[PDB]
Symmetry: D2
Subunit: 121 residues, 4 copies
């Protein structure tokens, strides 16, 4: 693997963290990165699928990302600027034997695109 997280120098900066702490830290980075990188992107039914695929594949690059699935909700025939409330993301981060499952989704009750941890394996 040519991934930077495999290097000894990278690893030395995470000796103060548990594997669970590392997993959610890395998960947080990726969800925050995803949101801010892509919000604003013109999106319509025409490019929905290509956008979803590109976001998944782009973010897969980042440290410790094991798998990811991206859905864009409420996409219309007329294009709009992507907004955070339209994102529905499932993310898996793997740190050694620990897998964190994280979620980005719109929570109506707080009118907020919330990022959180679903569960650990």
């Amino acid at each position: 693997s040519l991934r930077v997280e495999e290097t000894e120098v990278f690893k030395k900066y995470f000796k103060n963290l548990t594997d669970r702490e590392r997993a959610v830290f890395e998960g947080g980075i990726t969800l925050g990165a995803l949101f801010h990188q892509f919000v604003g992107t013109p999106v319509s039914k025409y490019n929905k699928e290509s956008l979803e695929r590109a976001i998944e594949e782009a973010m897969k690059n980042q440290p410790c990302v094991y798998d990811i699935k991206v859905k864009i909700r409420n996409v219309g025939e007329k294009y709009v600027s992507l907004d955070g409330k339209m994102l529905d993301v499932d993310l898996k981060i793997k740190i050694n034997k620990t897998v964190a499952h994280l979620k980005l989704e719109y929570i109506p009750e707080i009118d907020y695109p919330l990022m959180y941890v679903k569960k650990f394996e």
Copy 2:
């Protein structure tokens, strides 16, 4: 279609420009938009193609975009944040019978990712 630029309300805001002025204005918006939307995006050989394709299809949504081709240069096995100097873009804007062909490419002599107009068809 449902495209915003077809509405009479949209059109009334551009009665003060020539078709060449409009084409170049719209082309400028789209090149600025794509640079600033996508710079920063993680890119490797893994996602080079889906990223190129998604940029093309996203930008096609915008007013008056006739066609667009996006190439990301110097992509390796190891990922990097997309930077503007890696972009090589050919864009076509159509206003009535006027077509502006615009370019985004790296100019080594000024170390600059330059946006310009390649040619018109009128």
Copy 3:
């Protein structure tokens, strides 16, 4: 100055445009750039002014920007992600003796954050 648009290499890429065409092309670049760079940024009354000022100064770097004023509308005590429909921008582009005045503003009738040219000053 050290501004890239002052170099001969840069200039040689714009021989095919009138000054008005060049002004609106550069204006389109800056508006598209501003919109896509900053949409998404957390904004509340807390940081409204610093964001407005940072956007103005950042965009002043770009080729041929003469002046810019950025207002963010509908900012509350609670933060939101900056949305394009909240931007109200007046931009001046100067090419030799030509000044293009451009606008970004929300048009309720088409539910669209519209970029257009107000006027030229010659």
Copy 4:
């Protein structure tokens, strides 16, 4: 406080995490968000100070951000697009009594803008 993270609904999504896990999760979001929001921004000596201040004030809005300091390195008279390797960020996240101190900085040895946790209190 009108902050969303103070609401009961928000809080119920984090019962599965320790305060340290929460702090690094929230810290990770803000650093990934900051990087991807601002990378690409035109920056020169002219607007360096206003850009740093705006980044600091913007990101302070986010859940659980206690304090933040943003420095942009190697800024010249001629503008460049902000590059992630130019960022030098110190970030404090507070969850109840737990404070996590996080860092974004360029690590020459792996040519990487690394995000990591410096320490907890």
